[model samples]
Target: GPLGSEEVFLKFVILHAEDDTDEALRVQNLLQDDFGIKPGIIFAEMPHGRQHLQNLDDAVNGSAWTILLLTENFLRDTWCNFQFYTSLMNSVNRQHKYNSVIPMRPLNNPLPRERTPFALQTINALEEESRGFPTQVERIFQESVYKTQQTIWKETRNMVQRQFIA
Candidate 1:
């Protein structure tokens, strides 16, 4: 049955405010050390200012998933809003078929009502008690990339079986 067992591995690109340098580094280290996946992280120093929107579009275009680390400071940043807006637009253009943009509220930060449409309200509002910033970050990577890992394993196992049979 399709629902019974399916293996998948998700690819993720994390976007966060470089102003919060400490938090950004913590998240990046956690992803690499705990999950064994080097995420494509977009920080503040990547020449954003006037070209903020374009840079964000480029990142989203390159990545399979966009993980926004939302906080109070993040909400105040205009560039962050631009990134979120472009991500939402891209998701809409894609017909919402795939898991494109996922915003994870690390702290008890409340986003403005006007900015609500860009994020998936349901996922963002859920109380992620068990999965805090670090845990949730890792889980997103696992869930997104698990399918690819399973496919590779299946193909490798079949090759070995054929060799034994021959």
Candidate 2:
């Protein structure tokens, strides 16, 4: 049964290597089942069509949150690298507090610290810590809304802009 409305204030886009489909799905389900935040547009779940890369471009550009399922395979996949950097560039240009791009490593087959790129390493990938991944993800969303106040702020800003006549 559906829990929340499709209405979304903070959107999420998930990026993972094709090889890591199971892991990515786990995270996707976790978000949906636990928090009711479904990643609506995932490439693996998308229909085959033209401009595949364009689909990814649109997904990244449209979302406020981008989750990177960083693994050894992710490092080797060229497309994953492209998505990672694209998300990084978009995240950098936006307000820093948003800090929207999140990189995570699976406990079973994580990428080594030595091999992790400098930029990714700097962001501090979500790992097995005092609080589990589920807890951390929930906290991040709560903070993103309450701390940044993007939901109401963005809505009001857009609403105000429309106040000016066409």
Candidate 3:
């Protein structure tokens, strides 16, 4: 499977607005405590210059999942949009091919469908407002990454066997 190194421990990249650092850290801690996986976060202190682009690309491409915190500020932030598309692009290029970009919005101030970006509108998002939020996140990983049989897994096995047979 395309699930290789990061697959075993499972790494997540948390994308959110600079204003939402607290919320993003909360999500990071939740992931740490619940799943025991460390997530990469675009914190408030990170450089916001052109050099940051490389970090953004590295962060998203390195992780198995990109968690998009859908706050109103996130929708408005141009930088956030850049990070969003970076993750989406990686989603397209990934070998296993799953919903790598996870949109998570707070239930308290849920973004209306009309307000949500057209790309996000197409994908189902998780509501981060209840006790079940962590469970829901866990379920996605459980079903998509761990349980499901991916085409890449078969191809990889064949590729490995060919090397030895020849």
Candidate 4:
């Protein structure tokens, strides 16, 4: 449930289009379910309000990294684009150095130079060889804490299985 109280050295926000809700949720579930990364994501579909904007803004500025789900839907949505831009600008402006905006293209939706040269370089397409989240996300899993989270998840998974199986 809580994954563990040990620590969270890495966290991420997901910038997704409304049309890509299903895909986004799948990835969100993988991060929380398989990796034991509890409540580790901020969805782009967050509600709008006076203070609510502040809440999302606070999370946006606070997350260690951002994942941009690139797709045709992403191209059509204004808010998704805004979120993507904010993630890019915030990371670079503050000189985070790390690649905050990761491109998670669940589909082939090619992004060349005219579209996004950077995206062309770094893409973790879930629908590719992995056909699922864990293997797909591994390509871009840069932080050691991510592996730590996975190891803990294994222990947690094993405990839960033993409780039910035996």
Candidate 5:
């Protein structure tokens, strides 16, 4: 069911720890089913005592947008930190002053000072106010995704249209 030729789409890649399988799947499903994004990529889990640094690097380098799902487990995981660092570095190197790397904080865990640098100071916070705050969280998540998609679409469309005349 394609929307139409006039419709604009935004693509995104989500990077998160595989240790939090349930959370990752839930977010992925929501992004696909609810937010209408196709073919979203998630980073693979590394084996015990091993690191998938190269895979993380490839994903971040190839993706136009990176979504970081921060949780208690994510904060404690070294691999997640590497993913975050690489994503941040890629955004900086590519000079994407806009929202290239988005942090989707879905939990109540606090980020450490080392991980909470000034670059992430304006990271959007998706808080749960109560026990059953699924509706609220979903609303916020949808709104964020929608806004990001709109921004990306507008920029991309302008670029494409300019190329047609050039």
Candidate 6:
């Protein structure tokens, strides 16, 4: 129940390297097209300096999942780490009451956990240990927003059509 049922359309906050604007858009569609609900996005350009910290905090706290789209260069960028570390901190504080940080890997290459920072090394290890990740993905798709939305619309329309025709 903590993961929430498939029927519950999850609201996602996707984090990525600053350059991965296209990839971020893809995942945003992944949520809307595949998962049905729109997501909260952390923009690349925001109010600079200290005010931007507030922007990041607000987006992370607002969404159900902090999707970490780790590429080969994921840790190479400074802002990626900022987003990753901030989201991880919120997750550890149990702000989400469950595994709020969902790691979505687009890269086939393995993350060099050894090079990852001390704060993230344990998480890298834990991610490696989950052998049943495929099974977990099934649960990720268990609930959908779009298919159900279409069903309701079609059903309601059919009912109205019958009333008029009959």
TM-scores for all predictions: 0.51, 0.63, 0.59, 0.51, 0.49, 0.47
Q: What is the C-alpha lDDT of each candidate?
A: 0.48, 0.54, 0.54, 0.48, 0.49, 0.45
Point out where model 6 deviates above 4 Å. Answer: 1-10, 40-42, 45-55, 71-95, 108-110, 115-166
Candidate 4 is scored at a TM of 0.51
Local lDDT at 13 for model 3:
60
Residues 47-151, model 1: lDDT tens digits: 434434334444343244555556556655634555656644555343222244566444444555455444445453322333564455555556555455445
lDDT of 5 by residue, 97-127 (tens): 2235655554534555456535544544333
Q: Which residue ranges in model 5 land beyond 4 Å of their true spot?
A: 1-10, 45-54, 71-73, 76-87, 90-99, 108-115, 124-166
CA shift of 51, model 2, Å: 3.0
| Local accuracy of candidate 4 as per-residue lDDT tens digits, 61-161 | 33444555556656545335455656534442332322244555554345443554344334433333245656645544535744554455445446656
**lDDT-superior candidate, 1 or 6:** 1
Residue 53 in model 1: shift from native, Å? 8.8
The 10-residue segment with the lowest total lDDT in model 3: 1-10
lDDT of 3 at 108: 48
Leading candidate by TM-score: 2
Show the colliding residue pairs in model 6: 6-142, 6-143, 7-143
Worst lDDT 10-window in candidate 2: 1-10
Instruction: Please estimate how well model 6 matches the true structure, expressed as its whole-model Cα lDDT.
Output: 0.45
RMSD of each: 11.4, 6.9, 7.1, 11.6, 8.8, 12.9
- Ranked by lDDT, the better of candidates 2 and 4 is 2
Q: Identify the runs in model 3 with alpha carbons over 4 angstroms from their true place.
A: 1-10, 39-50, 53-56, 78-99, 107-110, 143-166
List, in order, the clash count of every candidate structure. 12, 0, 0, 0, 0, 3
lDDT at position 84, candidate 5:
61
lDDT of 6 by residue, 42-76 (tens): 44522244344434443343345555555567556
